């Protein structure tokens, strides 16, 4: 049964709730972004409207095969009427095509649903600036003060350096990057750009990337592995036994892999900086963890919530245990008392 934090009061609207069957009263199903925990349930056999971004729409048509008529894409930053309810989609700074949604209720209440988001000061000069938001459905993935991590630009710096160093020291080394969903494309696109290469990938990953409206994408990616010295592999596969296995397949064309595992937070964020990172080394294969996040740090979330001064906050992540729920409420009370809303 669909949980209350996936429903919008005073509408027939649900958000990211495609896994419960028909939800009684729901005229419209919103999908914030193409990540399987949020889309779990969609197929070619959906014949209810789905509202989403253009980019999410392309992924729905081409990867799950939903029929063009039931995909209502909407432009961002555009006041749009949807069953006689004004809504806006705003960029979430998550993965490609990921959105937050502003709902303007008839009764005068305004609600923001963040979907998954990495809060940023550029949001404070968006359409949110123009009016009061009463309710906030919030991505609470990293709602605890241990959760710090660097800026994406810091991380992309490190990567561009590591890769370009090794490639120049040894010109027969391959760069690999791990992936399992959309997101974090900047990692591999930045490395490939510094090395004068395209990125090489399986057919299915090429298909996924050809849906994202990246400008110039035909110049940046290929399915021809032989022709490329930055390769993408499944994240499952980014280990020694799998990198060894893969290093065979290239057929004596490279004598050393240098891989990157973009991850979110791990416990080594508590005791080590980004300029002071190392990889595990079994022979000639070197695997980097790099903490590239597409979710708000604790401080980033805090600033956004304290600027927004919402009258009420409804968590959408880590809501399954009473301890997590309770811990989160305590932070929301501190923020409000500090900020005087
Ligand atoms: Ni996500």
From Swiss-Prot:
Inducers of expression: During mitosis. The mRNA encoding this protein contains an internal ribosome entry site (IRES) in its 5'-UTR. This 5'-UTR generally suppresses translation while specifically promoting expression during mitosis, when cap-dependent translation may be impaired.
Tissue: Expressed in brain, heart, kidney, liver, pancreas, placenta and skeletal muscle.
Domain of life of the source: Eukaryota
Cell location: Nucleus
Job description of the protein: May be required for DNA interstrand cross-link repair. Also required for checkpoint mediated cell cycle arrest in early prophase in response to mitotic spindle poisons. Possesses beta-lactamase activity, catalyzing the hydrolysis of penicillin G and nitrocefin. Exhibits no activity towards other beta-lactam antibiotic classes including cephalosporins (cefotaxime) and carbapenems (imipenem).
Subunit: Binds constitutively to TP53BP1. Binds CDC27, which is itself a component of the anaphase promoting complex (APC). Binds PIAS1.
Family from the record: Belongs to the DNA repair metallo-beta-lactamase (DRMBL) family.
Protein name stated in the entry: DNA cross-link repair 1A protein
Source organism per UniProt: Homo sapiens (Human)
Range covered out of full length: 700 to 1040 of 1040
